[model samples]
Target: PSTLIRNAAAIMTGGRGTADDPSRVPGPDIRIVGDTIDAIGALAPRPGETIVDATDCVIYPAWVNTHHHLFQSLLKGEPFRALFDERRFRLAARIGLIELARSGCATVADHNYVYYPGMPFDSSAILFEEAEKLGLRFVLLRGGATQTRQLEADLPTALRPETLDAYVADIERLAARYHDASPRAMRRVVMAPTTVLYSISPREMRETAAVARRLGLRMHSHLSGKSPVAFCGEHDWLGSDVWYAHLVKVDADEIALLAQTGTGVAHCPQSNGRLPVREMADAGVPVSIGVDGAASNEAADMISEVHMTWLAQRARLASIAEVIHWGTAGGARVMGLDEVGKVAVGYAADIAVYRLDDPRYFGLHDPAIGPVASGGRPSVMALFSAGKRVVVDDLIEGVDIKELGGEARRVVRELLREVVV
Candidate 1:
């Protein structure tokens, strides 16, 4: 049986590749088989499955959140932070758990925070375990520490190193246990190395990447983000920002390597612009807009990061038509997901429905109406995560988001009080 989605006033079919490509606005028929897209462009429906009339709606592939600090959702302020503002981990992760549910983000990659030891924590399992119930498609990038060496840099001195082989074994264990290749499996896992400078050694970095490859998972870490880390040679002690801020030292070859390895990068322009990891756009690394931690970000709207990435980059170059092609499809590629990003037959039927009659899209001459185009709050009419209507009427389904929001808030607030007092 299949489902049909019809009457879309606007659509992002294959033709949306360029501004001149008259809107694919196929608003045509979209057919879904169990979990995958069977056909698109006004196709007839199969027996049993339902058909949806979106005559007044618009649809885009459900946006992907490539990088999110699931732990920082609790952090209070990101706007006024300097190049290196530290945050308390226990509080932020719980707050992030709450807000991600409200954002209509179907999928989230939570790079869990580095918390102080025995603040009585299981920071690694907290998010993956929590997200399972919330129903947000999740990627838990477990941040690891191999705290064997001496103190380094401004990073706090009191930390536990889980040993080279132990860390390696644990990450491999996590990937095999969590990387969901099944279409129905919503959770994905990636190995994340947190301390490129202090916690983990170069041997760990090289070995970890090796372990990840053997297991068919991509490796992630904090690298080339700060001035101190950016300019350092691999042996120079400070690391490169593979996942975090600034890009002053990344050369074209490194960019090529990033593309070649099919690695995902969450470029936070707001945090990146605040120096160390900051730089004007053309010089910025090829990245998709990602608002890392809600605490550091302290905001719920993802629409700003979407626009900031392109605007920040274009502000530096002369090419009026330069396409940041980094978002949507570009970011999807790095994540090694060919089935996502575009709306096509045989792909995952993950789609986002927005208001077509939106006046925000009224003056747009081209289909390049970036997410920022239709004023930030343009209603998200419906959202689907792999053919399941996860967000409808601007509200997430399957889970009682309102109740979850209230519950998580109470839980987080209490935890914060406990952590503070």
Candidate 2:
């Protein structure tokens, strides 16, 4: 079936620079056919075309949340977070996708490190199930921490560490089962070992990367503190197929190394105080934005995360266009999906639409700035994923927001009552 999204107020086509290419083009209608955006201009509607009236909308490339603990949807606003088991994990995961869908994020990549005691040790499978049901693009960066060394000994008792063989084996299995390298693949897998240096040895990190390469999947992990660069140098973990979450304390040479190696960075501004986003972006490093977990990022919405990212880049030359570009296209580039992250033809139809007619956007000269500069609110009017209208009018398709909210509260209560008997 063909679809016509017409009369957009401003189409923020995240198009790469070309002759006659513009960032914010005026009211160009987009036609989506099947899973790709077929055309991006006025077109005559076919007989059975699904017509969407975007009269009061600011259409931008639907954002991608690069790093998230979607399982932490239950953990809102608290500093310290607890562990997760199967039942509560599913509850939180479903609710998390609900949040992401309504927040105008079409693609989400979640890093799950929760490995329950016994029972095959895979809770991320539940996350995949939830994401599939919600009709959003998802990537499960399957990760776990094995070695319990020194200060890492206080890990939750429920999280049983796996042998390096067992760990890599599961990643292989999941990759073979789910990963799809196509342009608009809804479900994909990545190999991530929670903490390469902290939880796993330098040798193990090397072998893990080997497995990831062998399995033909990209690698992801946390590069939080000062030791990751040293560890990365030892194991040669810096490359295009790999991306680290927070390069927070990395120095000048390390930033240079990252750029030279063609590595990537998932800049979680709010969770880990703003990394040198502009520096990295300018250094030819693929720097994308993330909301991290709702536990730290109480405001888990990507729309709000974009605003937070914009605010954090105060000292740098953080133009509205640059920040939003880093948030959208930069993410798709880091993920190695060239077909996504744009609003032009031949791109995946993952589009974000926000209504600028609201009072917050009332006085704006350019409504395109609303997504990046305005107050963080639920301004997402609609969200599309791979030509599917998953979110319509800020409500996710086939999901009753109120009912889901009530269910989340009940599940949280259930989680609280389950004591270790």
Candidate 3:
């Protein structure tokens, strides 16, 4: 099957050439065959080809989320509760993916660290099922903690210690089952163990890294409230294959070290006290945006994350080019994905299209920057992954939205009831 995106009002290809070099070229349509983009010029439509009307849309490389907690989707409007279960997590994953698709996110790297006990269901398996059903790319980092905070002291039942041997074994098991090194792979697995100091001991972190290296899987975790450079340096964890979240309190010199080591930073401007996004990118560290957990961020809205990041930097942002680039290409780089993050010939056909006809965008002169600069709730006109249409006209394809709403309400009520009990 072939898909054609015809007459886009504007299109921005990330990392097309040099910085500030205008990736948004004024040209023709795009053609896709199978999963890869076949061409990007005016071409005669073949018989039985699917064509999308992008005449009033601003086409972009679908945004990539470097950090997320898909399981947190259940508690979007509620206060932090210690309630835990597998069925609740599955429903949360489905709803979170629904929002991510509508908000123009093609790929998500979820750091789900809370593992509920006495529930035999596999968290990673549920995420995989949801991503496949929703037609979204997913990176399950296998995130979990070995210990619990004092606040969680009441539920000592939730905490379980996975010996280093068992932890590494599980990584190898999942890697062998799901890890794919292909450029256009829809699924990937990363070795993620919550945090270094709190989640696991230094020894466990080092062994986890070793297992990841042996299994050819990447690594991710939170790096807050500690000296970034020394923590990573002590464990020899700094590398392009490793990326951390929340560098708000990181030392200036340590930031430089991360840049030097080619380490990536997933900055959550909305969740954390604003990050120096431009400064980190300028210092040579690959900076990407994360919507973080749904509890704090409320919604896994990638477009809002890009807009907030731009506002956080102000004039410091070199261009909307850079903002979109960090949101897509930079995050892809951090995740070690060769494909995606760009809408060009021979790349994965992961794309986002936003309608500029919305009333809020009435007087926007440049459609390229308008999507990020003037942001409210996401209004993605269309979204595609692997040349498949996941969302069109702000509605997900083949999704029972009203049914999902009912299910979401049921899940929340169940959680609240459990909390009351």
Candidate 4:
């Protein structure tokens, strides 16, 4: 367990490098062990190692949230009340996903299920037990979709119609209990199905993408997220719902059969405005930016969704080099992680440490282009999950946090009074 960050005047490392490239930051020092990240530039700590002193702190590569539905923070400010208007999506996924695992968010892609049958209510094992109580790193995407009446007509009696093999065996029993094949455990699992043309079907969307490609686990939904789901996939996938409109609406032959099976398209530009997000940064694909279902982005706040996916993607790709490639490494390759969206050296210390003098990096000279120019001011002074120190400076130490926010608001007002009695 080594830790020493030292005066990081800079250290962005989303690789392909930035902070205007002076050899991609990491020059000062960074050394941490036990959960991956054993070195970076000047590192040299050892002898009961543990130190943080990031001096001015900037360090990057730790901000992955492909999607979220954090129990919609229980009507985070209700309106005419059609589901608390999306404070992170549908009542903050019932009540704020543990304030996004105490704000460093090593990983998260939670697809709101909002269930209510016998009501023991798991809602995806309560976001992996709040990502093991805020150690923060979870990718559990067991979303939902089993609606009828052609997906809607004021449905919602707990969204009925299962038996499509019981929603593919509860998405393969949550992808065999949270899919983190330990390449560096932050918790993962994907096979979401909340939207592939109005609440699941086309053989439960190609048999839930063949059971997330036989449990290797990866697939997305909520295609064409808005504009009435790109106009209900042109009357149910037969043709032109704005062409597959938001799922890039066919034409490129279903985006080259989901770019030849390496599928991942979870973009939610505030809520499916329909393609040309700079043509997935001019065809790089693997694009994963979401905040959908907090009643449709009512507010789960991923730094205001990376500043609304960086200002409507640099004003519709007027190109700051394709909106800085989806704000560095095309969002860490749509959450595959690839050693965490980039920072180098065997990666996975799950870093984030911000406040590069935080007046929003005032006149920055690189803080990974200060999150591609302010699209990621996540406000944590420290955060490292696998490599350990679970958020130090910005504070989380010894964490009782008012008894985990008073037992997460008394277990979210007893799961919203057992879904309104």
Candidate 5:
């Protein structure tokens, strides 16, 4: 079956702003066949093809969220609570993925660090299953720590770290089971320690990189401090294949190093904030947007993240086109899912059509920028991942928002009781 999205008000191609790589198109029309974008232009509808009226709607490449902690969805607006049992873990994953899908995100790379030795449930498997059920791409950064934090000593066994040997072995197991190296793979596994600077020994850091490269997996981590970038470079962790979250303390020299190595930054503006995105991009660093986790960012959705990216940077850090590119194509670039982003022909048909019917978008000069410029949740007319419609009229196929809210309330109450007891 094919789909013809006709007469769109505007279409952003998710391109870097350039004449050759034009950002906006007078699309008015787009065609999807199978899982690829078949065409874009003025076109007549085909017989027996599904025709969607995109009138008054703007089309964009569905967002690729580069970094998140989906498990933290249940911990929103709370202090660090590592009390997630198997059921709570699954619920959190479901809630977060559904939230992202409704916000027009088709791909999510979750930096989930919830692991411990002899844990009863497979956190990696749970995340993959939840994302697959929603028809969204999933990347497990596979976060863990060989060295336990001081605060975790008094917590439950779930907060303890694994030995370096055990951590490597699990990565091997996960890679064999779920890793896909294709340009548009639906599932990917990355080697990401909880924090490169503190999670493991310096030697172990280099060793993890070696194992990841040998298995053809990408790398990611949370980085901080003034010299962490250089420290990563010294540990053989700097490359096009690795990206770090919340690099908010980097300096000019470190920025140059990032640009030179093709390393990327998953800028979580709504989380911990920025470290000169404009300067980094201008110096050739690959920049992408992430919502981090709902624990810190209550609105852990791409719409809110991109809005923050646009507004937080104004206070020519970026234009709307460039910000969209960072959130879409740039994210795909960092994750090495080359075919998963952009609205060009031959790209995966992960597309979003946003209806700007709300008064927030009224009287906009350019409706194309309204979704990001207006900084609110515009109605998602339709959201497609790999040509499969996942969201229609602001509703996911099998989700009941009211019921989900009730479930969340129940889980929070249980967690609160557990903490107190």
Candidate 6:
């Protein structure tokens, strides 16, 4: 069925601001056919078509959240102490995905490190399943550690690390079953150790990179150490296909190396970062926005992430347009999802129509910047992923937010209670 989003107040195309690719389009209207954008100019409504009243609503490309830990959804304002059984894991995944979907996020790359050797349940499979149920694009960054950190020394079996052989074998299996090489793939599997500098040995790091490249998978991990970027280069882990989370400690030389190698950074503004986003972009390094895990950030949503990103840097560097691009198109670039982030014609119909109906949005001189500048949860009038309406009027389809809240409270209560084997 064809759908017409008519009379939008403004449209941000997620472009880098060029003549041919302008950041904002004069599109008061947009049309979606199937899973792709068909048109973006003024158009008459066709008979038998679904016409959505987008008047006074601003449309932007649905966010592509480059990094997250969906299992940490239930861990908000809390710590990881409870053993996550299958039911607990599923609920956590559901809560996280739904939270993001309502925040106008269509694609999520979850850097989930909740794996252990001989674990009873499949966390990776559960993540993919929950995302699919909500019609959102899901990228599973299969996080594990071949070596243990001091913090993980006394953790339970479920928090333990896996053998290198076991990790590689599972990557191959997941890629065969779920990974799609398409530019607009709905599901993808990434090779991600918990932290490259600490999780695995140098020999194992190189080996993991080789195996991932052989399987045609992308790589991701948490960035640490003063010179970790250079360290990764030494191990052949620096490339366009690789991206690291929270690169807040890199130096000028490291930034140049990242640019030269085409590596990307998943800048989690809320988890805390003061990365040179403009410098990285100017140097040709891909920069994207992530909310990180909910454990560190209570507001683990794309809007809040981008909001903090815009404010973290002054007017000299970050602009509203550039920040929006980082959250949208920039994210897609890092994920190698060429067709999933823009609002342009022929791109995937992953669009967010935000209604500036709240009092906070009133008296805004430029309504286009309201969603990012206002920094509040602007009501999402409609959110589409692959041309499917996943959210309407700030509510997700098939989701009862109140009921989910009750369930979350119950789960938290259950988790707080001491359990005996």
TM-score of each predicted structure versus truth? 0.76, 0.92, 0.93, 0.34, 0.97, 0.96
lDDT tens per residue, model 6, 1-421:
8999999999999999789878999868999999999999898999999999999999999999999888788788745533788999999889988889888999999998888877788988899888988999999999989877655657777867788998999999999999999999999999999789888999999999999999999999998734778889989899998998877766889889999999999988778632257788789899998887678888999998888888877655367888889999999989999998899999999999999989999999999998898988889989999999998898776788889999999988887674534
Better of 1 and 5 by TM-score: 5
TM-score of 1: 0.76
Kindly report which residue stretches of model 6 are placed more than 4 angstroms away from their true locations once superposed.
Answer: 149-155, 273-275, 315-317, 419-421
Screening candidate 3 with a backbone cut-off below 3 angstroms (N, C-alpha, C), the clashing residue pairs are none
Q: Which stretches of candidate 4 lie over 4 Å from their true place?
A: 1-6, 17-23, 27-58, 61-64, 72-147, 150-194, 200-264, 267-283, 289-329, 332-351, 354-400, 416-421
**Candidate 1 overall lDDT versus native:** 0.55
Model 5, residue 126: displacement in angstroms? 0.8
lDDT of 2 by residue, 146-171 (tens): 77753335755665577788888788
Per-residue accuracy of model 3 over 351-381 as CA lDDT, tens digit each: 8888876777888788667788888754677
Higher-ranked by TM-score: 1 or 6? 6
State the lDDT at 350 in candidate 5: 98
CA lDDT scores, all candidates in order:
0.55, 0.78, 0.79, 0.57, 0.90, 0.89
- How many pairs of residues collide in each model? 16, 0, 0, 33, 0, 0
lDDT of 4 by residue, 325-370 (tens): 3433455566555666555677677777766556767776655456
- What would the per-residue lDDT of candidate 1 be over residues 1-421, giving only the tens digit for each residue? 5678877766664223465632254446777777688876757656776877776666666555667665445445442111112233433554564454444455666665353433344555666666665555677666667764455454442345455676666666777777876533577766677645555766666666667666766545566443433333343222222344334456555554444433335666655555411222234434544566655565544555656655665565421122223444444544555576566677777677666455666666653353444435556666677677766666643446566568557755655566453
Give the lowest summed-lDDT range of ten residues in model 3.
77-86
TM-score of 6: 0.96
RMSD of 1: 5.9
Q: Which ranking of candidates, highest lDDT first?
A: 5, 6, 3, 2, 4, 1
* Best-matching candidate per lDDT: 5
Which residue pairs come into collision in candidate 6?
none
Scanning candidate 1 in windows of ten residues, the lowest lDDT window is: 79-88
